[PDB]
Amino acid sequence: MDARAVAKRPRDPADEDNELVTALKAKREVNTISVRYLYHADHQALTARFFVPEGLVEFEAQPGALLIRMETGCDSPRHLYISLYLLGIRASNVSASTRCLLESVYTASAARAALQWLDLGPHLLHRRLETLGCVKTVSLGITSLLTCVMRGYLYNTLKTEVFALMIPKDMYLTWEETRGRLQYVYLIIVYDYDGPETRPGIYVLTSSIAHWQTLVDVARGKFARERCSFVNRRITRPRQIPLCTGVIQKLGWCLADDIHTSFLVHKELKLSVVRLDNFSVELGDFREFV
């Protein structure tokens, strides 16, 4: 109410003592626990822990990898988590040499069952999946635990190191020779419909385009063949109604200039991957296109 009260500068939390300090200050009691500086006091990023079976911890142990929930019609687990790299054994987009390569590493009592759940029913994969974010600082317990980043930059605590997102080279593609100073990242499922079976076609597609109208229009050039497959499945099969050629959804954004090729290393089995650097997380709802 006072005119000086509005003349005061906006509060700085760092100048103020932490609330654990203010309580101890009145009684002047001294606890053994440190109080001068609460950690994680300054993080715009938000996180939530994801318990995972230990047969999928590999490659995820390296910081920076996409995670997606995979809903199951079984009551337990209702939602097995899936690696972006473990997802590629099913995708047709992966090279046949790379597909036989990594698959030997991911074999497990648990991970092999996840492939069976993609064959349980007709329903398309994009309905069965939901993007979660990316891991930082794996716990690596006997029951694996992960700290997924719902939003914001991936980084080590106290900002000591900024983790970079890792994306396989087989899925990555560029829409333009001229990258802008900024470009959003888009996970994009695609379905090349076919007689005996409709294969998934995963792609990672960074682009300077942001508006949904301009993005889908250029998307139809590279994917016109799968678009032709969709109507072709209709005319061949009366009383059969396949839907959705694919799905686009926002995943985040990157500084573009920081992008450069890299490779994962595990079990003496290197795997080249595109390496986005300061990938702030910005999850987006699925947006089907035909």
Place this chain on the structure above:
Amino acid sequence: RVASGAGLPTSRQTTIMVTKYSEKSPITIPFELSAACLTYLRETFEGTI
């Protein structure tokens, strides 16, 4: 509670509150007095021995 290591379930604080009640059991003692003993304790007759 007690501290525990990483990869294990923890122990969130568990405040607990309870309230005792009370029982009751009254007693009573009848006792008789002869009506003559009352009337002699009350009224006093002539001072005969």
Place this chain on the structure above:
Amino acid sequence: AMEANIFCTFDHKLSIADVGKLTKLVAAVVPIPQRLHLIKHYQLGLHQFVDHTRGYVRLRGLLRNMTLTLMRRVEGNQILLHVPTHGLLYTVLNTGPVTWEKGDALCVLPPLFHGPLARENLLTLGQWELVLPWIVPMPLALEINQRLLIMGLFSLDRSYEEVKAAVQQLQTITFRDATFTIPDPVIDQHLLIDMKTACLSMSMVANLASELTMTYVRKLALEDSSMLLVKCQELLMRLDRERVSPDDEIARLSALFVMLRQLDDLIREQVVFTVCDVSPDNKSATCIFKG
């Protein structure tokens, strides 16, 4: 230094049992007609919008314009209301019948019932009542409207009981850990006017698609190099398999697009939350906000 919060004041006097009936609903989405700073309790909830002949679809649209708001704190007299800011996390009550799990794309829907419930109890002033909208996960929210629209398409013919057996299947969706019985929008065979419009909003569009496509596909087919348009006419010529002034073409095309704008309320759905951690026994869960 306190965070800004909308104030609100009930008019009717509250018994101590009533103010404690409200403190059980700390976190809770509360629609607000307009971002006014003061607000009467009559403005709270969908109850001011409650209608008889007007259908569920009218609640589906006006609720999108409502300002969702959590009840950050409850006291006497004034009641605080914390409008979410995008990108921050916000704990929310699981008032929705569906159980929540990690990462769900929650989106608000108006409350529903299937006759008497085990607990309809809520805060209740004289005549006034509160109604807290459901917070359904997104995949079910498509399943709700997909059932509600088809059920009204058969409303013209309740006379065949064999059709009712299909309506009984649509009436009870069975999501895991749930046993819903979606109420029939129809009452006494007659449709609600909102249901009659929503059915007209779609059937009129599909009818115009059957005939208007026969012209424009022809001139546009030869110019195309992708050839995908060239085979689109094949199914249209086989859509005939069963058994004009230039100004008329303009008014005919004009209705085809404007009806879709009326239909858009039932199509795309905004997501209002995405789940993170879930509390034990699923009483509530924190959810980072997302407009």
